[PDB]
Amino acid sequence: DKYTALIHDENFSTLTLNVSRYPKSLAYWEKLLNYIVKASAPICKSTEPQLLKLIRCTYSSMLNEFPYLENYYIDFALLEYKLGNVSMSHKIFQRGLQAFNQRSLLLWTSYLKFCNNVISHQKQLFKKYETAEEYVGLHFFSGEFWDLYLEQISSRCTSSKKYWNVLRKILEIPLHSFSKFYALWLQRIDDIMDLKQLSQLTSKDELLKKLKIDINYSGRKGPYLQDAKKKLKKITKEMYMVVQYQVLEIYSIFESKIYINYYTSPETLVSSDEIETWIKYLDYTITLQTDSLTHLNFQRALLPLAHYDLVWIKYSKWLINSKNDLLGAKNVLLMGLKFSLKKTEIIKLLYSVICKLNEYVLLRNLLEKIESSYSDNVENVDDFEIFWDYLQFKTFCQNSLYSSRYSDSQSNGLLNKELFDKVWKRLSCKEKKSGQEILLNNLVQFYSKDTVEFVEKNIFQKIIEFGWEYYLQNGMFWNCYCRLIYFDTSRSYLDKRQYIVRKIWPQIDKKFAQSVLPSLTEFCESYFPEEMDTLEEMF
Amino acid sequence: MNYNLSKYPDDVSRLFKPRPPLSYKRPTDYPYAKRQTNPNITGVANLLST
Amino acid sequence: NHMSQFIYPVQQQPSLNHFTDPNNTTVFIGGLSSLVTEDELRAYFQPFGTIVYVKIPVGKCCGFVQYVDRLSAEAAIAGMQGFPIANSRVRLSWGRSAKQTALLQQAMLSNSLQVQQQQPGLQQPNYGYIPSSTCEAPNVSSTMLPGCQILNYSNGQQVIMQGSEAVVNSTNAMLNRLEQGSNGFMF
Amino acid sequence: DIVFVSPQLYLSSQEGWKSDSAKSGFIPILKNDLQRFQDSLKHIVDARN
RNA sequence: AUACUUACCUUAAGAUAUCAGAGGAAAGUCCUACUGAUCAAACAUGCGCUUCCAAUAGUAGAAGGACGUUAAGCAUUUAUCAUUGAACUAGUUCAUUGAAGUCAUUGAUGCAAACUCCUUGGUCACACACACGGCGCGGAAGGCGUG
RNA sequence: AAAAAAAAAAGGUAUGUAUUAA
């Protein structure tokens, strides 16, 4: 049969194994799919169910890897529709609309187009359009959406009330094509043959008050109605003034600069000017203070570049401050963890959002998740920002868990059997791992008796005994080992300076001096001008 | 309509637009499988001839 | 069927001054104290983006700065407006650079033309650059993936930014700037 | 006939990287190639070790 | 429209109101702008034939609709089957495997009201006139009758 | 005594090719 003839082919094995080896390419997915479709080409109900199960699972498994592909949710829906079950088509349209958080123009337009044919019960059908309207209605290109909706009223509705009702709303929206709908409005004003039909525009009171025209007027009506059409066309000309201004600004500044409105792939790069125009377009949209159009223009901006973390951070910021919604910001950063490749800034800002939200079990859980990613070695990671952001928020947790061991009530932040072994394992790698001194500088921050003794003996002493060359040639090491003794509150000045000079300094080897002197002079120049000479005589 | 598989061009084909789909009403009659005239006709009895 | 219902809108050009120039970067910062150095002003305008600096006039109590990208410039104008430097509320807006300033001042005496010349563009495609981002310090073979910042500028050399080393370098200079700043060496 | 594989769950050392039934994110591969597939990823694991 | 080439194909049958009488070519047929009766159509034409045809002396009302709103109105009833494992009473919950699976639950069913809007008519004439239940001009729809 | 032959295409629709004006 055709199925087994497809399995034993070499191209299926090669294309498949490429996909499973390289998941995020999307080039191998689309070849695997385009091939398995073409093998099935008489795709109608006759073809055997094993093959349909494979091709279907191939679509559904591809759309999970790339949650933004509009033409593929559409295409898989159409496959299910040609195959003869519309319920599966509905469901996976719902799935695509849910992947975009209910705002994508193409899935709503291509969805409702499908919905016109397969759904009776006019009321529900219109509820689909009212649901689409409150989401994607204000999209700059959404006019063609409205062209559907108006097209569906005039065919369905005998009353014509709802057509005036909706078209009146379309007049106030700064779409890309506003003029198309202004022509329909002006024409429908032109076709009004009676005073009674002017109540369709607005009610009886606002016409007699604002424009001072009466529907009940009794007399020679014709010239009065001709005056009324002029008085009605003037204000529509004014609405045309405002909305034209807005559209021409939005196009002339932003929308004209945006050349790519679609997702492409995780391997796509976008131009810098396009980034800049998305940023400024989002600031402008925020300034308009229209929440629907604001979330829309974030989700609109999000699919062109989803993988940077750039628009994710901002879209968490405007929602954490302007709207003052902290949970919504957490949820934005969580959905940003999936698409964004860099993930470091999002996970730092996410640690902060979770801290302020006062969910500690969720943050500590997520630290367990990120340490489980590396197989419980975060200390061996190449990229330092992950280990550092992990280590300081981990510290903030174990301060709360375990009561402080040390006198003066100082919590033990970075000195603990769990974390100090992590730090020391990070330090034992020396030149190979990047962080180094940054991790060391924060070991000087304790400022007490017990902890200056602890950090004195357990690192700065052992590191001398093992005698590693990288840490001894370094001036930051000796500078920090001076600043650790020098800021102690237990020591007086005499034993402090005498301890630094009589012990700390002579432990430096004279061959290291050339590297050690510049950084260790900066400590002595500021704090110890008196003993500056005995420093120079040593080296 | 989009395709319009027809002899007519696009303007004539879009002129023939049908009314919207018929709304669904639940059947008030007997399903075709259940449709039958009255069975178990009593034959002409010896009691009838009586 | 001669005239048509719709046309594309045609619109006039606004004379090209330094306020209508979409490429302008340099921000004129007026109302300074003239007790301030230029390295202090750099400290103010550094975090908003990478700077190609121009000059601070002497005795004129107004300076100006120039960034690489306009997004950083606007982020600096909106970021600092009315922000006191040495107890003087600062008033800053758009302004040109030094050479175009010379070309203007020669015209101010002779009151002739004052024909502006807009700043040069970046010839835009660029897929590697992310505007309003800084390389905090200086072998790199990267993946060139979208999330990371591929190219960048140096305080005039285009450098490829290593995402791992950039954070540890920036934090290193951060912890140095505190110790030198407290004792008076850096300001 | 076909096995369903999750290279993410496999490289992350998690248990369920494969199953016979269709699940949301897995990629269908030929069963005999499964062993072969493991080979293709081993060097990646070898880089992490 | 004309000429040439190629393709597709060709005649269900019969009749035009009936009955009766007289005549022409014992039986039958055909025929008679021949005679009577009945029937049918068209056209006229009549009936004290029947029903209906909206306010301006006022901001109305009659018939019919909304595939209109209130309206997530009020009151009800509904959301798949099979296999395996764990717990459990002696049916219930959770997890896994397979099959089909109109959308809706702001739904569907019943109940009722208010409001708003559409189409239609002689918005005709004379009359504001204390009667025992007419006999103005037309239009619409019928019934009956004569020619 | 008898004798010898017949008169005819029809015309419909569709497709392609050419013609009908400065």
Report chain C's terminal Cα–Cα distance, integer Å. 74
DSSP 8-state secondary structure symbol assigned to residue A325: -
Task: Say if residues A123 and A160 touch (Cβ distance below 8 Å).
Answer: no
Interface of A with C in 374-403 (CB under 8 A): 382-385
A373, D12 Cβ separation under 8 angstroms:
yes
List the alpha helices (DSSP H) in A358-430: 360-373, 384-401, 417-427
Breaks in chain C after (C-N > 2.5 angstroms): 138, 155
DSSP H helices, chain C, are 38-45, 70-79, 98-110, 163-183
Residue numbers followed by a gap, chain D, C–N over 2.5 Å? none
Amino acid of residue A365: N
Measuring CA to CA, which residue among A201, A199, A149 is closest to residue A175? A149
Give the largest Cα separation in chain D, rounded: 33
Q: Is A241 on the interface with C (CB under 8 A)?
A: no
Which helix (H) or strand (E) covers residue A168, if one does?
helix A161-170
Q: Is A352 exposed, middle or buried (0-12, 13-18, 19+ CB in 10 A)?
A: middle
Cβ-Cβ contacts under 8 Å between A and D: the total is 49
| DSSP symbol at B1 | -
Nucleotide nearest to B23 (CA to C1'): E67
In strand E, the nucleotides that come within 7 Å of a protein beta carbon are 58-59, 65-68, 96-104, 106-108, 116-119
Which of A473, A485, A471 is CA-nearest to residue A527?
Answer: A485
Residue (of A262, A267, A264, A197) closest to A232 by Cα position: A197
CB A356 within 8 A of CB A389: no
The residues, any chain, with a CB within 8 Å of residue C183's CB and separated by 6 or more, are A526, A527
Q: Give the list of residues 6+ apart from residue A149 with CB closer than 8 angstroms, or none.
A: A112, A129, A133, A166
- Which chains have 3+ CB pairs within 8 A of A? B, C, D
Q: Which residues of A touch C178 (CB under 8 A)?
A: none
Give the closest of A269, A273, A307 to C124, CB-based.
Answer: A273
**Distance (Å, whole) CA A50 – CA A3:** 7
A296 and A132 in contact (C-beta within 8 Å)? no
Residue C167 and residue C19 in contact, taking contact as beta carbons nearer than 8 Å: no
Query: CA-CA distances (angstroms) from residue A227 to A28, A104, A208, A219?
Result: 67, 44, 14, 14
Strands C158-160 and C27-30: unpaired
Per-residue HEC secondary structure of C94-143 comes to ECCCHHHHHHHHHHHHHCCCCCCCCCCCCCCCCCCCCCCCCCCCCCCCCC
Nearest to C147 by CA among A254, A366, A371, A385: A385
Q: C26, C49, C151: which is closest to C99 by C-alpha?
A: C26
- Residues in contact with strand E, defined as Cβ under 7 Å from any of its atoms: A 49, 53, 85-88, 90-91, 94, 118-124, 127, 156-159, 161-162, 194, 196-197, 199-200, 204, 216, 218; B 24; D 19-23
DSSP string, D22-41: --TTPEEEEHHHHHHHHHHH
Q: Check A60 against D24: CB less than 8 A apart.
A: yes
Nearest residue to A375 (alpha-carbon basis) of D16, D45, D12, D18: D12
**Residues 6 or more apart whose Cβ sits within 8 Å of residue A211:** A228, A231, A232, A235
CB proximity B22 to A under 8 Å? yes
Nearest alpha carbon to residue A308 among A272, A339, A263:
A339
3-state secondary structure A49-105: HHHHHHHHHHHHHHHHHCCCCHHHHHHHHHHHHHCCCHHHHHHHHHHHHHHCCCCCH
Q: Based on C-alpha coordinates, what's the Rg of chain D?
A: 11
Q: Which amino acid is at C183?
A: N
> CA of D41: which chain A residue's CA is closest?
A21
Question: Cα A353–A356–A358 angle (5° rounding)?
Answer: 110
Of C130, C131, C172, the CB nearest to A437: C172
Cβ of B20 within 8 Å of Cβ of A156? The answer is yes
Q: Per 3-state DSSP, what percentage of chain B is helix, strand, and coil (rounded to 5)?
A: 20, 0, 80
What is the C-alpha to C-alpha distance for residues A384 and A371, in angstroms, rounded to an integer? 14
Q: What residues contact residue A229 under an 8 Å CB cut-off, 6+ apart?
A: A189, A190, A192
Q: Are A21 and D37 an interchain contact pair (Cβ–Cβ within 8 Å)? A: yes
Do B17 and A155 make contact, defined as CB atoms within 8 angstroms?
A: yes
Q: Are A338 and C147 in contact (CB under 8 A)?
A: no
**Paired tokens of C112:** 């002739």
CB of D30 within 8 Å of any CB in chain A?
Answer: yes
Answer whether A391's CB lies under 8 Å from A422's CB: yes
The one-letter code for the residue type at A313 is I
Helix H or strand E encompassing A349: helix A344-357
Say if B2 is an interface residue toward chain A (CB within 8 Å): no
3-state percent breakdown (helix, strand, coil) of chain C, nearest 5: 30, 10, 60
**Cα distance between residue A383 and residue A433, in whole Å:** 9
If 0-12 CB within 10 Å is exposed, 13-18 middle and 19+ buried, where does residue A107 land?
Answer: buried
> Measured at the alpha carbon of residue A286, what is the angle toward residues A280 and A291, in degrees to the nearest 5?
140
Give D30's strand partners.
Answer: D2
Pairing of strands C158-160, D18-19: unpaired
Q: Are A353 and A329 in contact (CB under 8 A)?
A: yes
**Residue A28 C-alpha from the chain's centroid:** 26
Report helix, strand or coil for C89: coil
Residue with tokens 């008489």, as numbered in its chain? A42
Backbone torsions φ then ψ of A446, nearest 5 degrees: -80, -40
Indicate the DSSP class of residue B36: -
Quote the DSSP letter at residue A171: T
Q: Hey, is the C-beta of A272 within 8 angstroms of any chain C C-beta?
A: yes
Deposited resolution, Å: 3.4
Question: What would the two tokens of residue A222 be?
Answer: 């014709």
The Cα A401–Cα A396 span in angstroms is: 9
Structural contact between residues C94 and C29, judged by C-beta atoms closer than 8 angstroms: no
Q: Determination method here? A: cryo-EM
Q: How many CB atoms lie within 10 A of CB A104?
A: 25
Which of A248, A270, A307 is nearest residue C127 as measured by Cβ atoms? Answer: A270
Return the bridge partners of C29, or none: C63, C92
In DSSP terms, D5 is beta-bridged to D18, D27
Nearest nt by C1' to A115 Cα: E103
Q: Does D9 touch chain A (CB under 8 A)?
A: no
CA contacts within 13 A on the Cβ side of D45:
14
> If DSSP codes are grouped into helix, strand and coil, which group holds residue C159?
strand
Give the three-state DSSP class for C151: strand
List the one residue out of A380, A305, A397, A300 whose CA is nearest residue A342: A305
Read off the tokens for C130. 């992310």
Task: Give the Cα separation of A472 and A478 in Å (integer).
Answer: 8
- What's the rounded Cα separation, in Å, for the pair A76 and A59? 7
A121 and chain B: CB distance < 8 Å anywhere? Answer: yes
